[PDB]
Design a protein around this ligand. Structure first.
Ligand SMILES: COc1cc(Nc2nn3c(NCC(C)(C)N)cc(C4CC4)nc3c2C(N)=O)cc(OC)c1
Length: 271
């Protein structure tokens, strides 16, 4: 729809950027207020860094993925400077929050609770026929009630045949990304499952880098021998075996997010 009929377009004055949370090559992230009283996050595009259509495509993907377990789209401003406005999460990214005094005091039980919540959200994405493509703790946000939501949907894609294929020069984070997407550019929901397995380690280690002590080429080589990540410190053997399911050789042998979600709630109500 044209901006004048767009239910998502808002006039810029309704917004007040208060605190800049982050800044980078492509824009800034602010805490702000909508119409005075409502805390919101505001993503703003650095003019010239990328096309506005490229930027705005994030807000169009989010429009299609509405669910309590995913970060909710709020509005857009489509005249420069371009804004994407969303649900505000007070405890920031999962990987940062796990390092704070609060985060450190969390039981394994609450940790498993959060794992289940993230899996619950990926269960919704999966059934909507989407993939995320960048699932990892840095892309999980935390609420003021220690709730978890999936975020950063820029790489998300609609699957009509469960397989999106990236450019031949496209690069992705090697430690978080399934072999087949690394090797062939082929992304399925089962690639997200492999990444979720990696995510489970960050959770149990409070935001530590996966495959401790290893370079990217070492990870590739070890994985190709049939090894997987060494058991993290303070990681229940049950969870580790759920990680191993996530990291199976054949994409199709890895579990659905619905299964992972059901298992982790069992783990959690058992602790
Ligand atoms: C990073 O530092 C902080 C960020 C935030 N908030 C946020 N960062 N953040 C992103 N940042 C990028 C990410 C961290 C998710 N990779 C990406 C997205 C996508 C657009 C929904 N949303 C957000 C929010 C949000 N919706 O609240 C809050 C903090 O409070 C202490 C600290």
């Amino acid at each position: 729809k044209p901006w004048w009929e767009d239910e998502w377009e808002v006039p810029r004055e309704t917004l007040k950027l208060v605190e800049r949370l982050g800044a980078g090559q492509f824009g800034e992230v602010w805490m702000g207020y909508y119409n005075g009283h409502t805390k919101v996050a505001v993503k703003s595009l650095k003019q010239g860094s990328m096309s506005p259509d490229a930027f705005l495509a994030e807000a169009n993907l989010m429009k299609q993925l509405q669910h309590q377990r995913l970060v909710r789209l709020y509005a857009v401003v489509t005249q420069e400077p371009i804004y994407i406005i969303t649900e505000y999460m007070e405890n920031g990214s999962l990987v940062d929050f796990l390092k704070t005094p609060s985060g450190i005091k969390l039981t394994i039980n609450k940790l498993l609770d959060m794992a289940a919540q993230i899996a619950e959200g990926m269960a919704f994405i999966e059934e909507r026929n989407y993939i995320h493509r960048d699932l990892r703790a840095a892309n999980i946000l935390v609420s003021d009630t220690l709730s978890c939501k999936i975020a950063d949907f820029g790489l998300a894609r609609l699957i009509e045949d469960n397989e999106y294929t990236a450019r031949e020069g496209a690069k992705f984070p090697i430690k978080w990304t399934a072999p087949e997407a690394i090797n062939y550019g082929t992304f399925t929901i089962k690639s997200d499952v492999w990444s979720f397995g990696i995510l489970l380690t960050e959770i149990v280690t409070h935001g530590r880098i996966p495959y401790p002590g290893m370079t990217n080429p070492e990870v590739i080589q070890n994985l190709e021998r049939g090894y997987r990540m060494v058991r993290p410190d303070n990681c229940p053997e049950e969870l580790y075996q759920l990680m191993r399911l996530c990291w199976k050789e054949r994409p199709e042998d890895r579990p659905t997010f619905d299964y992972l979600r059901s298992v982790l709630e069992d783990f959690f109500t058992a602790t």
